[model samples]
Target chain A: TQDYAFQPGLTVGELLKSSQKDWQAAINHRFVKELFAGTIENKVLKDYLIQDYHFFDAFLSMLGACVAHADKLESKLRFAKQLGFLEADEDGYFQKAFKELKVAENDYLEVTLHPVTKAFQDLMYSAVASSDYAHLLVMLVIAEGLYLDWGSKDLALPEVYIHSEWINLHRGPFFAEWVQFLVDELNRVGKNREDLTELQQRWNQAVALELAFFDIGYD
Target chain B: TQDYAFQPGLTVGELLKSSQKDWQAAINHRFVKELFAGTIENKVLKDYLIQDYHFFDAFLSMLGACVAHADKLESKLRFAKQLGFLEADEDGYFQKAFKELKVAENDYLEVTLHPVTKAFQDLMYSAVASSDYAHLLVMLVIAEGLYLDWGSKDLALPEVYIHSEWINLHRGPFFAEWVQFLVDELNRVGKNREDLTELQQRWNQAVALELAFFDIGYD
Candidate 1:
């Protein structure tokens, strides 16, 4: 059932390999299929935008919490800038799309979080609340890593710029580098701690939630 | 059915008066009644927290977007500070409660947006997305005004702070002042805008949503 070939040697990468089916479920979700085919529902994409948009604050909160608990300035700065980008660029994209869709400004603000989203956010909170740095790293990897994974696959781009831009946004060098940095950092930390089993467990749960997140859109 | 008196002359105060039946439904709803009695199901209180928690981000984002779109620095600063409090204080209360409830971080997170919650968020997005400052003001008035109204009423505070604190947080002096500030600002804007038949319509719908919001908790 695995469509994407997994590479060996990288820590989180290997861990991702181990959860390939869940990862694949996310990357190859029906919504993604519809997105690439240019047949996605207008409501589906807008709902995705709104739902995803809601998480930015919580995500920033988690990162900020992480930053507060971090020992090193580098780690703090990295999370800070990472949060800044999320608040700005990712939010901007949703703003632009909302305008283009002519979706009522009120409508975008009116969302009930899918249980999947609620759970994903819970995961973020639990991770940060515990101040477990490894869990934070794993969550980020699955959060963005899946984006980089599917966005890079050689699937044909959807015709509309609106649809294609989403994929392009993830495929860009900046995003790729950011994910790589996190992956390397996670790998480095895992080796230092000498145990990645818990990280892997958390990572697996996150992947499953990511798939649940996509399932929310189909519903 | 209306227990609260409507003061004449205040535009939104008058609008809220007209919707007295709906407002009462929210403030005197079964959920609130049970919450006061300390008889509400654990599931209900937990559900309310999770649902309300999910809206925190979108709510803050709307305020921040309002900040970016403001022509006056004063309005921008106002919204900016409003967002800051939400990110700090309101968010903290939820974290505290979530921890004490022993609600498995993942358990409550796995919720579908109640149809009503989804509708309410749509109302917020639709309002702010239009760049109509008046609609935004109306939404805020209905949004926070109801909280201040319900929180300050004569119900006995629950014996448990977990229950009582929810009421106390909303009734805090700062929050009271914040709601007053919003009301004053809305009134100032309302008089300047003059006729607000459309704004009233939006206001009424928001009140209805507030009731629906409480209704969802009971279910």
Candidate 2:
């Protein structure tokens, strides 16, 4: 469970790996189904979606989850401020990205229905609606946990790279902010709970699901 | 002032220095009067406090001012969270210090209410009371921003060496949770017109105040 105190003796990654099994089950991860969908449906996004698709789905999902977590805590609206912390600085990456992507406005998702991406969004929204902190956790936990491993499977379709180049930004644009966001959120859930037994179980389950997403994404 | 269309390429810190005079007026900076009220206070904290009290005062006050500038569009909690993300996961420094200070299981601010120490807290509380987003940009901007330049000086206290000798848990025990608390708090601020622009200035004020406080404390 969350017993992985990650004290000085243990490395962080070690503690995370200790909970892989539950993580997979949490996802109901039919990697092949999701992977196939990504491989086939992803062709549209491929022109824009660049490297690290494994991480992309979850990293972007994590951002969405943060938006959701903030809502749960009555703070989602402030994410732009959090996003601004880094993005606002001079020569900040956010401005650079808009230029790099060239779309400056919107792209494929803006053009199409974007069901490929919206699936994750729906999960986060439902989480906020139900106040399902546990199940909603999967919206993020599964994405990040899976991505750290699954990122490489992303297609490097250079032909449409410029057109769909925004895909390249899926994670890079808000990576640090989002990562900080998720880590803090998980840490909060872990810390605030007076119930250690239950918290640990939930966190461990989260970690396991992440790895399963990664392992299956590769498969 | 919220205009980003033309930076002519100005760096964040540089831009803050440009507005220093305005911030000096926007804040209630009485907090500076207390850093050395007693026996050099905490020599580590005092040394830094002594050299830069005026500037630190201006900087924290400026953090409060940033909220005023944006018309108080954000939350103090989110500002604190950003502060934590800005200073977290430092080395074993916190752990080492906690063991030495003897900050115990139930101890929080009340346990170590040295008058001067309390002054620092009062400064933060006042800033938060001023504006939620300012609460964040001010907290560590007063601490870590200074630490960025004066970590060794702050750590040079003989007690630090002595504390390191007995055990490595030398920092305050509450730090990890404290940092996490700050991050969550800061991430909670709401968004608005000129959001990042106003927030970044506050963040800059936080950083500059650290420099200013340490300058005064050390001198």
Candidate 3:
């Protein structure tokens, strides 16, 4: 069951490994230090949930666009499943956090889109619109892959800190498999590309931006 | 004739000086080094213009929001004049660059906003929406001040690489004065804050983000 196949050329995972080892460091970051020590400020958690919620809108749009553009029935089904998670489970968590935080509806609805926020949305939109599913696939991997790294952190939040629902949301095997499927599909489809350089560029861009996104949560 | 007076407690100038020393080095950033040495890749300049042009839309949105929220007439007019600059010469530069780059109308119009680009826009939006004019002033100081820093850098872009228009656009005594005026206004507005810690926070955030913006230009 663990076995997977790929074409002979460089896989997306290999390409990314050789190109951007710097982001690999972010995979095991000390961002958890604050949380485990119970020193994490309320604003930090607040900002994370708020921005992550804000991200859902753009994230959904990208997935929806991908579903529409996917070449195969299984691809569409997989994207649609992820979309269901967003609508039900993901949205459920954001709403729970929103209510418990006593966040006003207006405040929840009225986030001035961050520069990265709009950029992420635009990048995904452009990727889909450019008719390049590879671009969309790379974005997906970064978004989901980074969550796996951060969410799977062994450190736990203190009881007072919103139950660490933010991390909890990213755990579980379903999301893990979802991320793996995206790379597997990318590895399969990208086999015929003439220059994989652009793919690497997009991958690096997504990973770097993910780190920056993690940053604004603290600042 | 150039002298100005300030009322004293934690003036914005004093606060910014005491903090954000790291940003002082951005005036001679690596991006500039690459450009001046004529080793900058073609895609670097092209992406810079493309993303910068894309930024104009959200940048205007920030200014417009600030204008709408300003408590006084003079403040609104100050923002209006800057809006006029964007609508005229700045817009013209983007349009011309778009043509010279042979970028199709549809193509250029559809760029994915960079993560920093969206974050920067969101920062400005929150500043204005926070209903504190001082927040807007800090945002302005960083935007115009950094332009004066880099745009008026001692080195010049090669003529073969598009006639130094990017630098030329930010030069002239008028623009220099405009930047100073922004800081002067920030100083004036920020003088009375009880703690002044928030002012320092905003100042540092803006300056740090400016450097990150330059890094994105290269990446």
Candidate 4:
């Protein structure tokens, strides 16, 4: 037996480490590579945007859960402020891109959800149902962290407004601060908890879903 | 059999009519009566306020769900505006009253949740989980509508600032407009849906919870 046993702290760093393989796969997926290189087909990008739009509602639901379940007033207000950003930034991006791409109104508004989109949404709904702050944070941290990772990568700059703007939305100082806030919040609330196993499982599932979502563009 | 069959439209009016009895009971609860009459004990009132404070987080969650799930831009903004009101108006009152009453920090911060309060929160979490706008509207409509009903009643004026201010929070024109907005939103969304049966059940359950919540003060 070893003289000492090392135990990892229940922190966001540890959580990310546990899911490192899948998280790396998600960040380095083919769709992201093409998006940055500006080699992606417009049709493929449009389809991806439409499918991703379905997550907008689900994201709001998660934010709502966070507002309801967070223990601190500061945390709730932070989440509330992000809502304004989401509406103005992400929502603004979708409208301009949809109009520029001439995406059919019906396609964006009434399109059937891809399997990964539906699965991710179902995962969010399940977290909302649990009403557990850590559960919600695990899903949120992975989702935003994966985006920030790929977005900050030293890749070729895309010429198209759609591709460049999408990357800009995820990699700015404000976006990085928002993701850090989420990671800190998860660690603050999840420290020394016995339920780390379940939280880790959720982390893995969210990362797996993120990888699959990027694959949608190729299909 | 008579040839004429009058079917009720799936409207807010019909939903309220279906739960008229419980709605009446809640609005006319002894707690409401005593508070309006200025005959309530300070201890009882303090306990009620503390228990009710637990629902504040749950209310924010519902507002979050509404912002995420509502169909129109105007609706999302409306819900967002209410979060500000909730933080300023309701939260202001609680802070003031708790200090005036010399309520222990532990009592307000770490208090055991009353059963009815827990159940009501569970109901809200369930609604948030469903991610169904109508399910959320039914609960919100009943909760706010009952307060408006009771607050608007012709009753004796309370001398105490706490009792009087609580009444003022729920009965003003602004509050009335807010409830109307909720009612109209529900009607707008639920007008032609086939799931009226489930919506009605949620409405009834919310009303029942309201009555039970009012009874907590007496216990």
Candidate 5:
């Protein structure tokens, strides 16, 4: 992507290789370990977690790599806005009725999700600290936005979570927010809408990649 | 659900609705039109309309609704089972896959959904009059089994027709079954074994409301 060209000597492949290394570092960042260290007492939160637990990792990892690719800081920020929506949604669903159930938190909702959460937070800092505005933008903006779009829709496995009423509510607005975020990020990079197909594919790849992220542990 | 009341009430309600205006042959044997007009495609085998497109209203309507409710059925079905290996792991990656894939249509290849296809076409007889025990079982056991499961998977759609690939394929098992009716083994999954739940919350509602059939032009 013309979005991430480096110095005169640094070719695109080198940049990608470098960025991927960065992405892996980001994915395995230490903060991620600490995030899960804290326990969530409400199992309703766990109910929420088990129901859609796969979504967060896939989301945050891509957010790191993508922020490294955006052409402009503005473009990356737009992407960040979308990622923010994902963040909003992950927490947004449970803030309601879950409080009402007051029963044992659905085990699904129980996991403490921090690293994935911090990955986005760190992307913001990375952008601020470095001069490589393009890399940060790609890593945070594009990836985060794309993850939200893919997720907000149906994951197609509604049956995984045993608790029904509580989980279904998140499906509607949470995904819609992601859809809106993706449109913004796409327009930013596709300036004048010239390279839409490329943008769409990249968005799709990141989305698809995020989906694939869930199987990592078992392997 | 209100459905428990449905079977007995439907028997009694029709006795009166058929004799509207205080019973002046208002509609002698009216149920012959209501009940027997189409075989119980709603329950036994409904996907036949996918081909004929003619029985779209009479049979497919109920069948589709049954599938719709199965979405919830699958949801509640899992509730019936404990969340044994169902955790999000260290990172909330959303990657817990149930079966490893050997080409995505793997589910289609394994089960016996074809009886559903054959039952739909069997609507030619007076049904309750012409069918034998085997046919009845094909209708109830084979066809019902698949649709119920399809509904289980199909209901996973967070967004209809958009994000739910699993739903489209929910029909695939039956699609493959159409290739082999003798292989009912391929067509079935034990009821309530992650295949049928929320019988009341979802499909039950659709089935209970015979009006749903009427609303869709069931005549």
Candidate 6:
């Protein structure tokens, strides 16, 4: 009789539920569909990787902010440890993929920040500037969660390393653990807060930006 | 009888002379050529303006940095006054032109920052972060000087307000005086500094980015 009454108490769950539409749209986006099917054009994948690579610096800055601002020493250590994974895993993948894809250094390194990319960077920076750990955690959750959502899909993986490695990077035990850590942190920090409205708004904004980001990488 | 022995003492003049090739290329860029001529296509002009408008915020941030870092009260006042002109003059022109050109708000306001524009913003932000007035002045001179260079051209004005007003905005007594003020300030502050190498490098970088920025707005 009360089918809709069983809402989760965790802030992360509420956020995911609130942005269900966009989160679903993002995972089911044409970019993701083609990427998983191995039918995504080389040029489109190249362009997407180039734009995504630019997000590296902003992501580093956000993580650094978390390390500095987190109330608990354990949280700080967790954020610091993730930075290494980012460098070795994510950064390593970009180098190999860019080489295999034959992406010119100038094309990838000097490429313009597409509008959505710029907006996403601005959002991350704003969270850092807020000096509020909850704010940063919410955004980090969305950033990683969106990838985990699609990366864990049951669809057959593409054979190309470019596509398969990207999926593997997000879905593996290491990434899943990292995302769980972020979700737990956000829920723990955000649950007792009176500013749920602000957190929800930020979550929605991040999801919308991610949705727009996937819309790129096409002609 | 040394023809090149009489170099100017002003840092602004030396920087300009050093980058004369790129400066000339920028002013005479095909974009400028087509823009000055009434024959430029509407789509090209619209796209260029859209990209150019994105610089408005970065420019404001740089100006604010200058006001914060300038050594003299008079310089701070000059920088502050210029901000008003930006809001009323340049910003006003954008609103009207976008309307006339039928540029959707999303296109103009939310459009992606082209690679050149992104690089240029990074350059400006770097200077601001340096908290060095001399570093900021070199870029300001180039940004304003480039416009004045092309705006002061003797070519006939376009019949359309979109093209002609842009030309007029960069020329006339107001803009000419403003550029001169920036040039004079850079000379005064930069002439006695030992970081001439850095200033020169920054100037060259700005000009190179400007050259690339002109390359956009076309297929």
Model 1 residue B171 CA deviation (Å) reads 0.4
Give TM-scores for every candidate, taking all chains together and pairing residue i with residue i: 0.49, 0.34, 0.46, 0.65, 0.22, 0.50
Ranking by lDDT: 4, 6, 1, 3, 2, 5
**Superior candidate under lDDT, 2 versus 4:** 4
Model 5: what is its DockQ?
0.01
- Full-model lDDT for every candidate: 0.69, 0.36, 0.64, 0.81, 0.31, 0.77
For all the models shown, what interface RMSD does each have? 10.9, 11.4, 18.3, 3.5, 18.7, 18.1
Expressed as tens digits, the lDDT of each residue in B108-212 for candidate 6 is 557888888899988987886686889988888888888888888888888888888889888888788788888778878887898889888899999988888
Which CAPRI level is candidate 3?
A: incorrect
lDDT of 3 by residue, A124-201 (tens): 656655546677777787777677756666665556535566566676677777877887878888877886888887
Candidate 3 stretches greater than 4 Å from native: A1-10, A18-22, A35-39, A156-163, B1-219
Best by TM-score: 4
lDDT tens string, model 1, A139-205?
8778778878778777789988679888877886788777777776677666656557777778889
Per-residue lDDT tens digits for candidate 5, residues B1-219, read 211101222222222232233222211223212222332233121121122222221222222112212223232122111111111120111111111222133333343424323334344122222212222222332223333233333222344221132223324554343223312311232222342232212222222222222223223
* Candidate 4 per-residue C-alpha lDDT over A130-163 given as tens digits, one digit per residue, 9 for 90 to 100: 8899999998888787788888887777889999
lDDT tens digits by residue: candidate 5, A1-219 = 322211112322222333353344333433222223322233434433433333433333244223323444333333344444434444444444344435344433454544433344344334333423333334333444333322233324233222332234333554445434444443343344444344333433443343333322222
Residues forming the 10-long window of minimal summed lDDT in candidate 3 chain B:
B1-10
Q: For model 4, how does the per-residue alpha-carbon lDDT over B1-219 read when each residue is reduced to its tens digit?
A: 211011223487778776777877878788998899998889889889988877877877788878767777567756766765776677789889999989877767678898899999999889978878999988888778788888988776788889999999988788888888888788889998999999988888889889989888778
Clashes of each: 17, 59, 11, 0, 46, 2
Please state the error at residue B173 of candidate 6 in Å. 1.1
C-alpha displacement of B195 in model 6, angstroms? 1.5
> In model 6, how many backbone clashes occur?
2
| Collision pairs in model 4 | none
- lDDT per residue for candidate 2 within B76-166, as digits (tens), equals 2233233223223221333343445454434432333334434454555455445344344435433432222222223333334422321
Q: How large is the C-alpha RMSD of every model relative to the true structure?
A: 17.5, 13.5, 19.2, 7.5, 20.1, 22.8
- Candidate 2's error at B92, in angstroms? 2.3
The digit string of per-residue lDDT tens for model 1 on B1-219 reads 333322224766667766888887788888878877878777788888888865554455445444434434345445545554555556668878888777676766587888878887788868646655667777776777788778877878888756887887777677777777667667766775655788888888888988888866667
- Give me the runs in candidate 5 sitting further than 4 Å from their true place: A1-90, A96-121, A128-219, B1-219
Model 1: CA > 4 A from native: A1-219, B1-9, B192-195
Top lDDT hit: 4
